[PDB]
Structure formats: C-alpha cells, structure tokens
From a paper:
Members of the myomesin protein family function as molecular bridges that connect major filament systems in the central M-band of muscle sarcomeres, which is a central locus of passive stress sensing. To unravel the mechanism of molecular elasticity in such filament-connecting proteins, we have determined the overall architecture of the complete C-terminal immunoglobulin domain array of myomesin by X-ray crystallography, electron microscopy, solution X-ray scattering, and atomic force microscopy. Our data reveal a dimeric tail-to-tail filament structure of about 360 Å in length, which is folded into an irregular superhelical coil arrangement of almost identical α-helix/domain modules. The myomesin filament can be stretched to about 2.5-fold its original length by reversible unfolding of these linkers, a mechanism that to our knowledge has not been observed previously.
First, we determined the overall architecture of the complete myomesin domain array, including Ig domains My9–My10–My11–My12–My13, from crystal structures of a total of three filament fragments: the My9–My11 triplet, determined at 2.5 Å resolution; the My10–My11 doublet, at 1.9 Å resolution; and the homodimeric My11–My13 triplet at 3.5 Å resolution. Remarkably, all five Ig domains of the myomesin filament are connected by α-helices that are identical in terms of orientation with respect to the preceding Ig domain, and they form a substantial, structurally highly conserved Ig domain/helix interface with an area of 350–600 Å2. By contrast, we have observed neither a common interface nor a similar orientation for any of the My–My domain-connecting helices and subsequent Ig domains My10, My11, My12, and My13. As the overall geometry of the IgH segments is rigid, the limited variability in terms of arrangements of neighboring My domains originates from the diverse helix/My domain connections. Whereas long six-turn helices are found in the My10–My11 and My12–My13 connecting segments, the corresponding helices in the other two connecting segments, My9–My10 and My11–My12, are slightly shorter, with about four turns each. Because of the smaller length of their linkers, My9–My10 and My11–My12 show limited direct interactions in their respective Ig doublets, whereas in the other two doublets, My10–My11 and My12–My13, the neighboring My domains are too far away from each other to form an interface.
Author numbering: 1246 to 1446
C-alpha cells in the first residue's frame, strides 16, 4: 500500500475517497464497506480503479448526516489481501460535510449570475447614500431586482455587461430610507441574493 484510504473534497464539492496500492494486476477485486455493510455503485457511490497508478477511488456528490461513520476498501489481488479504513466521525466528518456543501453551492452559484462583492453603502453628493455591489456572469436576459422591505424599487435597466457594478442612489438620505435592502440576480442559469440592513440611529 502506497497510501491508506483518505477523503478529500474536490472541485464542485465532490467527495473523493481514495487510496493507492503499490501495484495492481488488472485482476484485483475491491469491496467497498460503510459501517460494516457493503456498498455498491449507483446513484450514491461511483467507483473507479486505475490499473497503472494503483489508485482506487470512490466518489460521492455530498455527505448526508447518515453518512457519518467508518469506510473500508477491501482489496484482493491474487493471494494478497489488504484493507484500508478511514473513520469519518466527529469534527472531521462535520468539516468534510460543510466543506463539500460550501464548495458545491459556490460552484453552482458561479455558473449563473452572482455577486463578487455583496451590498455595501457609501455617502456621495449632497448627503445622498449610494448602495453598491459587484456582480459577475450577467447576461442580457438576467433580471436584476432591487427591494426595500420586500417591496420592489425600480432602477434603470442597463446592464449591457457581464461583470460590473450595480448601484442604487438614495437621494437626501433620512430616517424613511432605513430598512432591509436586497438585490436579486436571476435567470434560467441560477439565482443569487444580497442583503443590507440600513439603519439610521
């Protein structure tokens, strides 16, 4: 065994269980085990063996809570028999699960219109407040919608860009302008949201 069973998070948040054998014959057999029960290729687990490199892999799209536990690859090649086990319990499980969830959601988010910088505010002009954000992967069809307190606020609709700044000018800022501002980006590729609680005293 060149390396024992280990688990890492890949791009798109995929979960990769892998180990490396020094050598495989091409006639090797692997059994995959989770919490003392054999598991099989299908909608949940995908398995791969690369003969030349000795790499044996199992992939998952994400970790459900019930996926906490002990994983074993049982390897048989000729008379040689080995196993390698990883225990995914406690903090390591939580960390893997959260990292997978975060990376998967981030990859998805980025395939559509999304925020690069979330809402912030500045003062400009004659005591005005400008709300601003920075967005990316916008297309002509993308809807950009601004709200205060769940009520739409109309702005000029000129996003003749893919990446850029979106702003909302609040003229003569006063108490009536306090509230929860939101900007939604959306098209058939995805939806992203930003929020800003603007107070006045």
């Amino acid at each position: 065994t060149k390396s024992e069973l280990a688990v890492e998070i890949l791009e798109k948040g995929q979960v990769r269980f892998w180990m490396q054998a020094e050598k495989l014959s091409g006639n090797a057999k692997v059994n995959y085990i989770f919490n003392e029960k054999e598991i099989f290729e299908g909608p949940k687990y995908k398995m791969h063996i690369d003969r030349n490199t000795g790499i044996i892999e199992m992939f998952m799209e994400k970790l459900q809570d019930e996926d906490e536990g002990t994983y074993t690859f049982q390897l048989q090649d000729g008379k040689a028999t080995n196993h390698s086990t990883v225990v995914l319990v406690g903090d390591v499980f939580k960390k893997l699960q959260k990292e997978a969830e975060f990376q998967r959601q981030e990859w998805i988010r980025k395939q559509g219109p999304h925020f690069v910088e979330y809402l912030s505010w500045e003062v400009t002009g004659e005591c005005n407040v400008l709300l601003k954000c920075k967005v990316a992967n916008i297309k002509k069809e993308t809807h950009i919608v601004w709200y205060k307190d769940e009520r739409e606020i109309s702005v000029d609709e000129k996003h003749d860009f893919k990446d850029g700044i979106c702003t909302l000018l609040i003229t003569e800022f006063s108490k009536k302008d306090a509230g929860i501002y939101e900007v939604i980006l959306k098209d058939d590729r995805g939806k992203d949201k930003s929020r800003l609680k603007l107070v006045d005293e």
